């Protein structure tokens, strides 16, 4: 019969264009043409692909292997589908630093992978150093560290690498340069040689959470203080507390599947630094912050009118893209992600993509995209950003705040209240936009006494091991319980979100929380405790 197969990818031509699916028959797996009535009840997915592409996504795994499972068992599940490119995405996460002069300020940091606007295909992150005063007496860093006009401080940090992509990196580990301010490059962290012999499967850390993180300073003799830094730099750092970590895309080799013995061997000829360019010019990019407010990037194969070979890829409608790339489903035919309807999200587009979609909205005579969702065609190179509509965001698309009404609603469940603190149970996502709480006491006649009355004394909210938030008064108190001048006096509590926070003392070094917009969060009389 010589069933025709030009692309030489195992699946015959007719099958790829019309729809097929792999289904395990008791112990033997066979490929079958999609039958509408007998396969749907079994919960099998309808695959489609390109009859002229050995790999529709253009990544190194053929159309046949992805759906059949003959593949590096580490490729993330969501990438098994033939229309989702599988490639690595490595960024650097810095946990904490320490400083001194060539009496060491050691503060813990929190990092988030960033993305800003005209946004380009290069990964970068952003660390934010904690500003709260661990020591009472450590007012003004300039003095806690003996920094003089003609001195230089030494920097020694700990970092870990994070793989948030969908495929493993193997031998090499990328070079990445730290930069303070707009263009002041302080140091480039060397690419250690022949040491990352382990694997970074998607959503894993290197080195793992159970081992010491890789010390940034060598601790050897390579440079006495590689991170030198004149005085003026230290000043910007004191004003901004921000550092950027730019990383390039030089990953390792690729792991291929061998038919002869089923061995997965690292081939030394093929290298990710040759493939990524292909993927980045033939796919639509979708960025989503839905799961835990972290930026997840996926690439979907879309058609490109100008190129013959490219019209071969199956048409991909936006609605289906969200379904197969992230996990959206249809309990009642309404697109939703774990309860949250698709309508609670924004759609933002780059100027090109924006223009293109305006056209698409014209030939259909519709104004609300949330309706015509199943009629939007994706072409190559569009960039789409789906962000939660309820939270406020900064310039680098990081979650930074929210509307007060949401903040209050998140607190309407008071599990317990006493004179020693609150034990709340709040939805894990909100507590990533709250910097701290202001506690105050109110005289029966309207007076106001704020307990922790200093700008740098807000980090008073810890988290218990059972996920119950616990606020401790004695932390930034005088290690004494809470006193009340009247069992009828109301106790008011305000919360301050990051966006509305102050990061340095004011002009005249004011430390009071006066000119800070505060949202009321609690108010029970003295006897209601």
């Amino acid at each position: 019969p010589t069933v025709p197969d030009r692309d030489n990818d195992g699946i015959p031509d007719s099958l790829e264009v019309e729809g097929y699916t792999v289904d395990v028959k008791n112990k033997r797996t066979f490929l079958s043409p999609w039958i509408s009535n007998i396969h749907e009840k079994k919960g099998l997915t309808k695959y489609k692909s390109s009859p002229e592409k050995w790999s529709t996504a253009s990544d190194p795994y053929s159309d046949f292997e992805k759906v059949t499972g003959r593949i590096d068992k580490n490729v993330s599940p969501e990438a098994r589908h033939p229309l989702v490119a599988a490639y690595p995405i490595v960024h650097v996460d810095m946990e904490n630093i320490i400083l001194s002069k060539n009496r060491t300020i050691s503060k813990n940091t929190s990092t988030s992978r960033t993305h800003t606007s005209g946004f380009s295909n290069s990964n970068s992150s952003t660390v934010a150093i904690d500003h709260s005063l661990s020591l009472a007496g450590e007012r003004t860093w300039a003095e806690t560290m003996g920094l003089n006009t003609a001195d230089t401080a030494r920097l020694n940090a700990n970092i870990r690498y994070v793989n948030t992509g969908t495929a493993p990196i193997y031998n090499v580990l990328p070079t990445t340069s730290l930069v303070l301010g707009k263009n002041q490059t302080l140091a480039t962290i060397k690419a250690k040689e022949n040491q990352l012999s382990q694997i970074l499967a998607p959503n894993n850390y290197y080195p793992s959470k159970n081992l010491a993180p890789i010390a940034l300073n060598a601790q050897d003799d390579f440079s006495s203080t590689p991170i030198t830094m004149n005085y003026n730099q230290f000043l910007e750092l004191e004003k901004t507390k921000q550092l950027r970590l730019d990383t390039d895309q030089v990953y390792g080799n690729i792991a291929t599947y061998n038919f002869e013995n089923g061995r997965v061997r690292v081939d030394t000829g093929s290298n990710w630094s040759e493939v990524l360019p292909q993927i980045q010019e033939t796919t639509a990019r979708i960025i989503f912050n839905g799961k835990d407010l972290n930026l997840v990037e996926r690439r979907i194969a879309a058609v490109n009118p100008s190129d013959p070979l490219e019209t071969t890829k199956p048409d991909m409608t936006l609605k289906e893209a969200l379904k197969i790339a992230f996990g959206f489903n249809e309990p009642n035919g309404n697109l939703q992600y774990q309860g949250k309807d698709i309508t609670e999200f924004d759609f933002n587009f780059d100027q090109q993509t924006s223009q293109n979609i305006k056209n698409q909205l014209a030939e259909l005579n519709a104004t609300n995209i949330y309706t015509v969702l199943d009629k939007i065609k994706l072409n190559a190179k569009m960039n789409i950003l789906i962000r939660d509509k309820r939270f406020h965001y900064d310039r680098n698309n990081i979650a930074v705040g929210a509307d007060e009404s949401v903040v209050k609603e998140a607190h309407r469940e008071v599990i317990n209240s006493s004179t020693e603190g609150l034990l709340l149970n709040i939805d894990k996502d909100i507590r990533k936009i709250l910097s701290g709480y202001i506690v105050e006491i109110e005289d029966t006649e309207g007076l106001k006494e704020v307990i922790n009355d200093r700008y740098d004394m807000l980090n008073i909210s810890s988290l218990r091991q059972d996920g119950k938030t616990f606020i401790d008064f004695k932390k930034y108190n005088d290690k004494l319980p809470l006193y009340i001048s009247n069992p009828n006096y109301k106790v008011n509590v305000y919360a301050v979100t990051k966006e509305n926070t102050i990061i340095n003392p004011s002009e005249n070094g004011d430390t009071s929380t006066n000119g800070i917009k505060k949202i009321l969060i609690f108010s029970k009389k003295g006897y209601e405790i």
Partner: protein
């Protein structure tokens, strides 16, 4: 490298979909093919013919009204199984009938095919040849050569427990008095 893809490719890529019920008919017909045709003509000549049911073999008009008591059957390996679960039964009487439950897995696996062929051999020895008493000295002579032989587990493979306890060699009288045990072997 290009060579290997083809073999795996052919085995997995079923070009067309036979259908939901066609496969069933095709499986049973292929199975009976392997048995020499001449056996089938002897079966038809002596009367009843095999009809393939589809549902629970336990409930069929031809078999429901007869032999209700004999619910205990022994597979080829000697382990007891209930009839309802079992997928093939046969009955010896005035109307010799053999019934096989249709399934799609007779070519792919073998443990199921073995029982069907096993039932054909029991009908052949007990119902066909018995009309001529064909099992006799030649069969008995080979039989005798198996019992007395150097640690030959062959006995374990074909003899039941009852046989492993006859001390001397087999005798032409024994087959006459007991003819179910020999026919089984």
């Amino acid at each position: 490298q290009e060579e290997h893809l083809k073999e795996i490719m052919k085995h997995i890529v079923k070009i067309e979909v036979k259908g939901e019920e066609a496969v069933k008919k095709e499986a049973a017909e292929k199975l009976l093919e392997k048995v020499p045709s001449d056996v089938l003509e002897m079966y038809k000549a002596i009367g009843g013919k095999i009809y393939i049911v589809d549902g629970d073999i336990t409930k069929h008009i031809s078999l429901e009204a007869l032999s209700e008591d004999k619910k205990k059957i022994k597979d080829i390996y000697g382990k007891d199984a209930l009839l309802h679960e079992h997928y093939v039964y046969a009955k010896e009487g005035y109307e010799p009938v053999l019934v096989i439950q249709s399934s799609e897995d007779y070519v792919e696996n073998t443990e199921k095919a073995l029982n069907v062929y096993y039932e054909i051999g029991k009908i052949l020895s007990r119902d066909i040849l018995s009309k001529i008493n064909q099992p006799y000295q030649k069969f008995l002579d080979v039989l005798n050569t198996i019992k007395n032989a150097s640690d030959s587990d062959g006995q374990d493979l074909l003899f039941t427990n009852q046989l492993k306890e006859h001390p001397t060699d087999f005798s032409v009288e024994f087959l006459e008095q007991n003819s179910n045990e020999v026919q089984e072997v």
